[PDB]
Each structure stands twice: as C-alpha cells, then as structure tokens.
Design a protein around this ligand. Structure first.
Ligand SMILES: NC(=O)c1ccc[n+]([C@@H]2O[C@H](COP(=O)([O-])OP(=O)(O)OC[C@H]3O[C@@H](n4cnc5c(N)ncnc54)[C@H](OP(=O)(O)O)[C@@H]3O)[C@@H](O)[C@H]2O)c1
Ligand SMILES: NC(=O)c1ccc[n+]([C@@H]2O[C@H](COP(=O)([O-])OP(=O)(O)OC[C@H]3O[C@@H](n4cnc5c(N)ncnc54)[C@H](OP(=O)(O)O)[C@@H]3O)[C@@H](O)[C@H]2O)c1
Ligand SMILES: NC(=O)c1ccc[n+]([C@@H]2O[C@H](COP(=O)([O-])OP(=O)(O)OC[C@H]3O[C@@H](n4cnc5c(N)ncnc54)[C@H](OP(=O)(O)O)[C@@H]3O)[C@@H](O)[C@H]2O)c1
Ligand SMILES: NC(=O)c1ccc[n+]([C@@H]2O[C@H](COP(=O)([O-])OP(=O)(O)OC[C@H]3O[C@@H](n4cnc5c(N)ncnc54)[C@H](OP(=O)(O)O)[C@@H]3O)[C@@H](O)[C@H]2O)c1
Lengths: 309, 308
C-alpha cells in the first residue's frame, strides 16, 4: 500500500473486533486496509482462552496467530501504526503517526478501551502469573484455590460471584465502605459462605515467587497493613473509554463515554462504524466472541453504505 | 440425565446459538441441559465455512464436531429430542419422547426453517453446486456463472455480492416486481453482469457430477430456457418459529421472529433467546453472530438465576 490510495474501508485497530471486521470486509470484496498498533489487542495479555467456541483451550498467542492468518488468506493489508485523526470530506482522510494519510469511503473503529491498572508493585511482575483482569474469562482456572478480587463495581461483584463457584475462598477487596455495584449483586455475594469482604482497603503490593502468593493490603481507616495468602488476584477496577478520540473526531459518545452505536454498529457520523469494547453495545460484557461478531456486523453496515453510495 | 431433574438453565436447540449459550452457561457454573433435535442445526446443510474468524476453511461437519467437543469438555449433557412445550409452573420443559425437565431459566436457540423450493435435482445436487447462502459461498464461485432464485433482500443482496465474484448472475424471480428494498433493486439493476429473468420459475436443476444447468419457465409465455450455470443459489427466505412462540406465550415481532431486547431477553422473564429465531440482526444469518448472541443470552440467564 502507498501513502495516499483510497480504500472502500479502513479499519482502525488490530484487536478481535478489527480482525472480525477485516474478515467480513474482505469477503464482501471491499478494498480493505487495517491500521492498528498492537496485533491481537488485549489478547496480548491473556493466557489461555477457552470462551471462544471452536478454539478449545487455545493460547492467546495462538489465537492471535490464527486470526491474523485468517485475514491474510484474503490478503488484507495491515499497517502497524497509530491512527491520529479521521478527517471528514465526500470521502474520509485518515492520518497515521508515521505511515501518512489514506483515503476511504467508510471507516470502522475497533480501538478498544484501556483497562485501569492499580499501579502497585508486583502488578506487572506477575501479570499472567496469578494476575488477571477478567473474572468471567479466568475464573475456571482457579477451582479450589484462594483468590482476591479488587474493586467495588458491577464487574468486581459479578467477578466475586463467579469466582465463589470455583474458588475455595474469595476476598473482595474494595477501598470504600460502600459499593457502586448494583445492590442486588452486593446482597447476593455477601450471602456466599466462601466470600470475605475486605472493605476500606487497598492493595499496596502483590508478592510471590514464580507466581502470585500474597496480596498486601492497607486498611485506609486504621492504617493497618496485613498480608493475605492468595493464588490469584483479579483486578476489576474499570476501564477508560476512548472518549477523547471520539470527541476529537466528532463522534458521539453515550452517557458512559463509549462510542455511541445503534444495533447495526453505526456511529453518529454517516459512513463511520464501530465494533468491540470501544462501543456502547453490551457495555460491561467484554469478550472475544462478541467483539468478533460486532466486527462482522460493522463490516456489513459498511458494505451496505459503500455499495449504496 | 433423568426426567424430573432440575437445571439452572435449559437450552432448546443444538445449533451454533445453542452451543454458544451452553459454553458460557457451563462456564458460569449454571447446571445446564441442552435439548436439541438436530446437532449443528443449519450447519448440517452447509459445505465449507470460512466466515467464522479463526476456523479457516472448515467443513461444516467438522465445525459441528469441534463445537460439540467444546461444550462436552464442560460435561454439558445433550438430549437429542424435540421440545414440545415450555410451561411456567420455575419452568417445566416437555419433550416429545424423553419426558419433562425443570429449570429456573430457559434459552431458546431454535433457529428458523429454510423455505423449501422443491424442484427436480435439488436433492441430487445437494452440495454439488447448489447453495442456500449467497454471502457465505460467493467466494467459492469466482469467475463462474451462477443463478440466484428469489426476489427479496436475501436474493438481491446475494446477486450483488455474487456479481462481484462471479462471471455473471441470472436473477430468477417468479414475480414481475420485487419484495426487496428499492435501494437493493436499483443497485443490482446497475450491475452489467446481472441478468433479470422475471415472471419465471425454475423447473429443474441438471448436471453430471455437479450442477451444470437450470431449466427456467416464463409464467407469461410458457417459454422454456436452459441456462448453463456452475452454481444455483436458492434465496427464498425462511419461516420463523412464530407458532412455537405464540404457543408458549412468547411475543414475536412484525416479521414473526422472537422479540428480544439488546440482552436477548424475551417478553417472558426468565426466558431468553439467541440466533436466528430472534429479532436481533434480523436476516443476518451467520454462525459468528448466533454464537455471540448465545454468550449474551447465557449471561442474561446467569444474572437472572443468581438474582433469583
Ligand atoms: O476486544 P477489541 O477488539 O474491541 O479491543 P482490543 O482487544 O483492546 O483491541 C483494540 C485495538 O485497537 C488498537 N488501537 C487503539 N487505538 C488505536 C489508534 N488510534 N490507531 C490504531 N490502532 C489503535 C489497539 O492497539 P494499542 O494497544 O497499541 O493501542 C488494539 O490492538
Ligand atoms: N449489568 C451488569 O451485570 C454489569 C456487569 C459488569 C459491568 N457492567 C458495566 O460496565 C461498566 C464498567 O464496569 P466496572 O464495574 O468494571 O467499572 P466501574 O463501574 O467504573 O467500577 C469500578 C470501580 O473500581 C474502583 N477503582 C477504580 N480505580 C481503582 C484503583 N486504582 N484502586 C482501587 N479501586 C479502584 C472504583 O470505585 P470508587 O471509584 O467508587 O472508589 C471504580 O468505580 C459499568 O458502567 C457497569 O454498569 C455491568
Ligand atoms: O444458527 P442458529 O443456531 O440460530 O439456528 P439453527 O442452525 O437453525 O439451529 C437451530 C436448532 O434448534 C433445533 N430446534 C428447533 N426447534 C426445536 C424444538 N422445538 N425443540 C428442540 N430443538 C429444536 C434445531 O433442530 P431441527 O432441525 O430439528 O429443527 C437445530 O438444532
Ligand atoms: N435489511 C437487510 O438488508 C436484509 C438482508 C437480508 C435479509 N434480511 C432479512 O431476512 C429475512 C428473510 O429473507 P428474505 O428477505 O430474502 O425473505 P423474503 O422477504 O420472504 O423474500 C424472499 C422471496 O422469495 C420468493 N419465493 C418464496 N418462495 C418461493 C418459491 N417457492 N419459488 C420462487 N420464489 C419464491 C418470495 O416472493 P413472492 O412471495 O413475492 O413470490 C419471497 O418474498 C427478511 O424478513 C429480512 O428481515 C434483511
């Protein structure tokens, strides 16, 4: 591909939603270009994926390999870079951090979201070695083990509820006295015999040997520091939507800051579609299967928009 | 399993949506039971599947096998039978010949039934050049001549994508007008390699090992023509499970599909649905989206049960 050159559609991102959209866009014979920074997106920080039907207990690394090979069978050009802006015109102009500008009749955003990190020692050290950011995804991996879940929202509460059906013991560590998660989940989890609430507390450090062995916690009231032996730590403290990219490109966001889409993945800007974690659809529920399917839908909406145009 | 046993969730159907919901249901630790008549559902009539990301050019029969192995890894019991009734008494699911089962929730993945055409050769050339899905199989017919039967959105969109891959397309329709959206008609109309064959019907499909011709009859003149084609795409629609829905107190939309909101919730609390029996992404009949809706319906089933 050459700086310049127009495409029927340019896909921003290289996570599951992006591959999903790429596969369908290429199969509809739209001239397609994928521009994204990290191949696999969040799959780069996953370990074993067993929630994508048909790809049994597959290594995330292998999942990325086969997703890329699948779109490469259709010869979709993939540029590894960052999209800086998406300019409206008649036709779209998409600027990258290096590779230049490209034109397109439609654009599909699969930019994902940034996971919020605790920012404490041991966090990167043990990522993928006892630390997970997805309870629904990795809970089955902790049957009869001891774990801690960190946060006080719907995903931390639902995480603890799921982990309670697998783990011997679950510590729900949250920094406030109260929870913003739905009261229903709170009441539900409190009633669990193997769940212990550790309120007004924050994690100070995550320790271990080859893997996680303990979480050091500080009670923010009593200043008291204590160590809990755990086999795993699930960080469920939320995400940062790409509200700045959206606003910066004239794209409407919902009341949560996510890219606003309708059923068929259409954004507020005619000709611009979006898929995966960056959208308002199925907020909360972030899985590979749903992002890949939303990509197929976004690609379908772009095909209809381009062919009708 | 045994009649009378209780489950957290019972999934009806054994298609991609059902596999999808069973996978997430078992992983949420919901005691799960799948009751479906035909394993793989519509996948039974497909050939190579190359639109489900990560499963490259896989035979539909092998997609069915790995889908089943994925849920059997979680020991989800599968009962091969037909669900006759779903009653709210918790739920009591009545099957045709295996008894009744109890459940706190139910996920419907019953799909739709393809409208049969029924013309000589249709059976003789199954998998032999006859397809029931233009978007799925178009890439397999690059530089080949094909015919598309139908006059709706499916047929027109099919003729549109096939016009891009194929040499030429014969759009054969029995009416003088189209049931497809006007925008679809004018778009196809502008494709130089799409030839409308209106007020016409297919009389039969011929070939040797594979399809080689289609015999069409003009309803207004009785004239007959043999058209040489390498492929025949039958796009005449599907019949939703309206009657099943109404018989079970489930609301349907204006097209007769089971109505669901964004979370795959039907009009009945505790009853969810996924895949092409639902009103969501109506007409988009893809394995990938059906599997995803199953994950969503299993998640809504999970939230419902844990909160009950
Ligand atoms: O699951 P999912 O597929 O929804 O999400 P995901 O797994 O988070 O993947 C989203 C993808 O979008 C890429 N991306 C984000 N902002 C981008 C930009 N402005 N230009 C180019 N690529 C960008 C990400 O790379 P980075 O991680 O490098 O931003 C990532 O690979
Ligand atoms: N309907 C459902 O079943 C469901 C399930 C899961 C998620 N969701 C949705 O998805 C969205 C995001 O879910 P979410 O619960 O992950 O995000 P969230 O609603 O933002 O809650 C996460 C919480 O973690 C805490 N936290 C943040 N940074 C922290 C830090 N550095 N150290 C310790 N604690 C920290 C915060 O609590 P404080 O700021 O209060 O201290 C924060 O609000 C929500 O809008 C939610 O409704 C829905
Ligand atoms: O794609 P998709 O997964 O959405 O749909 P799909 O491929 O059409 O599969 C739907 C599944 O539901 C089954 N089914 C339909 N009505 C049923 C009933 N009343 N009781 C039990 N099984 C039933 C089908 O078997 P049949 O072939 O027997 O309908 C099939 O396995
Ligand atoms: N919005 C979109 O872009 C889109 C795209 C694809 C599919 N869809 C959805 O998919 C659903 C079903 O597919 P569809 O729209 O193609 O079905 P459809 O709306 O029923 O149109 C198919 C047509 O095939 C003709 N036909 C039926 N039986 C026939 C036979 N035995 N011999 C010859 N011709 C026959 C019929 O025309 P006559 O009855 O007039 O003879 C029939 O209306 C739709 O209801 C729609 O919601 C939507």
């Amino acid at each position: 591909v050459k700086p310049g050159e127009k495409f029927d559609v340019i896909i921003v991102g290289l996570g599951p939603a992006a591959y999903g959209a790429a596969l369908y866009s290429a199969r509809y014979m739209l001239k397609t270009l994928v521009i994204g920074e990290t191949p696999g997106g969040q799959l780069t920080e996953a370990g074993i994926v067993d929630d994508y039907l048909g790809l049994i207990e597959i290594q995330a690394s292998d999942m990325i390999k086969v997703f890329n090979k699948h779109i490469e069978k259709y010869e979709v050009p993939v540029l590894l870079d960052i999209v800086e802006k998406i300019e409206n015109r008649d036709e779209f102009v998409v600027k990258t951090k290096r590779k230049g500008e490209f034109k397109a009749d439609s654009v599909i955003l699969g930019i994902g979201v940034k996971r919020r990190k605790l920012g404490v020692p041991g966090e990167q050290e043990f990522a993928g070695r006892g630390i997970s950011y997805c309870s629904v995804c990795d809970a089955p991996l902790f049957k009869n083990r001891v774990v801690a879940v960190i946060g006080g929202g719907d995903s931390a509460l639902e995480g603890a509820e799921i982990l309670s059906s697998y783990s011997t013991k679950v510590y729900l560590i949250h920094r406030r006295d109260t929870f913003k998660a739905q009261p229903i989940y709170v009441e539900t989890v409190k009633k669990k015999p193997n769940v212990e609430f550790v309120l007004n507390s924050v994690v100070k450090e995550i320790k271990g040997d080859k893997v996680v062995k303990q979480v050091v916690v500080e009670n923010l009231k009593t200043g008291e520091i204590k160590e809990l032996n755990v086999n795993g730590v699930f960080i469920e403290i939320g995400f940062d939507p790409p509200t700045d990219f959206a606003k910066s490109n004239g794209i409407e966001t919902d009341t949560n800051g996510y890219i606003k889409v309708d059923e068929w993945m259409r954004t507020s800007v005619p000709g611009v579609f979006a898929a995966g974690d960056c959208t308002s659809a199925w907020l909360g529920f972030r899985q590979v299967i749903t992002a890949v399917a939303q990509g197929a839908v976004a690609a379908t909406s772009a095909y209809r928009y381009v062919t009708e145009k």
